[PDB]
From Swiss-Prot:
Organism encoding this protein: Homo sapiens
Expression sites by tissue: Expressed at high levels in the brain and pancreas. In the brain, expression is highest in the substantia nigra, locus coruleus and medulla oblongata.
Any single GO CC term annotated in Swiss-Prot or TrEMBL for this entry: lysosome
Description of post-translational modifications: N-Glycosylated. Addition of a bisecting N-acetylglucosamine by MGAT3 blocks lysosomal targeting, further degradation and is required for maintaining stability under stress conditions. Acetylated in the endoplasmic reticulum at Lys-71, Lys-220, Lys-224, Lys-230, Lys-244, Lys-245 and Lys-252. Acetylation by NAT8 and NAT8B is transient and deacetylation probably occurs in the Golgi. Acetylation regulates the maturation, the transport to the plasma membrane, the stability and the expression of the protein.
Residue stretches making up the Peptidase A1 domain: 20-361
Shown residues in whole-protein numbering: 56 to 446 of 501
Bridged cysteine pairs (disulfide): C161-C365, C223-C388, C275-C325
Protein name (database record): Beta-secretase 1
Active site feature: D38, D234
Cited function: Responsible for the proteolytic processing of the amyloid precursor protein (APP). Cleaves at the N-terminus of the A-beta peptide sequence, between residues 671 and 672 of APP, leads to the generation and extracellular release of beta-cleaved soluble APP, and a corresponding cell-associated C-terminal fragment which is later released by gamma-secretase. Cleaves CHL1.
Induction: Up-regulated by the Ca(2+)-regulated transcription factor NFATC4.
Protein EC: 3.4.23.46
Length: 391
């Protein structure tokens, strides 16, 4: 396999806890900003005023190409809020396609628990569809503009690369965190075959899960439960998030599989770190988790399998400690399944918008051990898969 997108390989930095970001420029002359790659939202929004956690921000007054749309936007969400002023400007991705686009930009003027101290990013690139744009679906998302204005194919792909150990801010800045290939698939970024699941509807990147196993054991829930009220692929969420009832069942199963060691309730609630002596993390006691996804062929599914090296997120205790420490990166949701960054770190994920499908392959950068790897495998005969979708 040849890698045909060398200019875009290794263009991301970051980590699952704080997000993966790409360098972009906005305005004339170009203003460089680091931008979070977010497949779970649809606005391009950048810091545009001083904030304690921003080293730089978009200065509209210094851009000759800035256009004011004379419209505000207020975006409250569960864990925070941002508000800003809409406009358009010329945008480029230096380690991207060799093109400049005029795109909508929300200039963020006030925010709460949005920016992350030490994350290094100064804005967000919402890569999902117009239906979920704010303030409404008339605000064309960045990727839509890119495809309309250029010859870039209507597809992008993400390889998010977790280190398998903690990185500080200085280390993140100096390290490669993955690849966003805009307009194509780079065959150097995965091993084995790509398997595709349909995009159920173009809003979020919505998919359908048809079976869940923990170490090969069927969780045995009605498949609608896995997709209640949706299942999405979201690079802008850290954890694998599961609907309450599925979370409860899965945690019970994972506890049972790992029962040779007892962990505190705070660990399973995703709040508390657990630590082992350097090098002694007992990966083998934790189970693999398989999610079966609807295939493109009638009555066919395939599965993706992750390791504890994906769902246990490395965290530092103290800079002086030599212990290997982790948080449990599966958590409950009241808004459906979210296949977040820790899941995506296992896989090369192809967002094939043109063909309304998402591809998964084993990532060439996934963390594993001598005994087990992540997997993407198929096919399986599966009936009545459409019925697994929630209405
Ligand atoms: N694909 C295969 N899978 C196996 C294990 C899961 C792979 N890991 C390795 O080969 C390996 C080698 C050196 C190292 F530092 C870390 N890992 C499981 O079955 C046979 C073994 C070799 S080939
Ligand atoms: N995908 C959504 N996107 C939003 C972005 C801001 C949040 N994501 C993050 O901070 C973040 C943190 C760690 C990661 F690995 C990835 N992302 C934007 O809309 C609201 C918020 C909710 S979840």
């Amino acid at each position: 396999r040849r890698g045909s997108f060398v200019e875009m390989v290794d263009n991301l930095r970051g980590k699952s806890g704080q997000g993966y970001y790409v360098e972009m420029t906005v305005g004339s002359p170009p203003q460089t900003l680091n931008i979070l790659v977010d497949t779970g939202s649809s606005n391009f929004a950048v810091g545009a005023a001083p904030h304690p956690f921003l080293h730089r921000y978009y200065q509209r007054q210094l851009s000759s190409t800035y256009r004011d749309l004379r419209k505000g936007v207020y975006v409250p969400y569960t864990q925070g809020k941002w508000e800003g002023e809409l406009g358009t400007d010329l945008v480029s991705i230096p380690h991207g396609p060799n093109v400049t686009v005029r795109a909508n930009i929300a200039a963020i003027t006030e925010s709460d628990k949005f920016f992350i101290n030490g994350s290094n990013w100064e804005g967000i690139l919402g890569l999902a569809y117009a239906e979920i744009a704010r303030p409404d679906d008339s605000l064309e998302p960045f990727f839509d503009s890119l495809v309309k204005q250029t010859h870039v194919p209507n597809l992008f792909s993400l390889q998010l690369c977790g280190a398998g150990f903690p990185l500080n801010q200085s280390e993140v800045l100096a390290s490669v965190g993955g690849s966003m290939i805009i307009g194509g698939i780079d065959h150097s970024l995965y091993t084995g075959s790509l398997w595709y699941t349909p995009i159920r509807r173009e809003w979020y990147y919505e998919v359908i899960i048809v079976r869940v196993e923990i170490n090969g054991q069927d969780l045995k829930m009605d498949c609608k439960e896995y997709n209640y009220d949706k299942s999405i692929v979201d690079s802008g969420t850290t954890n694998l998030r599961l609907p309450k009832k599925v979370f409860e069942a899965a945690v019970k199963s994972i506890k049972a599989a790992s029962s040779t060691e007892k962990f505190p309730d705070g660990f399973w609630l995703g709040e508390q770190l657990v630590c082992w002596q350097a090098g002694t993390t007992p990966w083998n006691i934790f189970p693999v988790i398989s999610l079966y996804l609807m295939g493109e062929v009638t009555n066919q599914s395939f599965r993706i399998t992750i390791l504890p090296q994906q769902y246990l997120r490395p965290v530092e205790d103290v800079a002086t400690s030599q212990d290997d420490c982790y948080k449990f990166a599966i958590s409950q949701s009241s808004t459906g399944t979210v296949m977040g960054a820790v899941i995506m770190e296992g896989f090369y994920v192809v967002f094939d918008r043109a063909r309304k499908r998402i591809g998964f392959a084993v990532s060439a950068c996934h963390v594993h051990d001598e005994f087990r790897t992540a997997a993407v495998e198929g096919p399986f005969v599966t009936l009545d898969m459409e019925d697994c979708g929630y209405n």
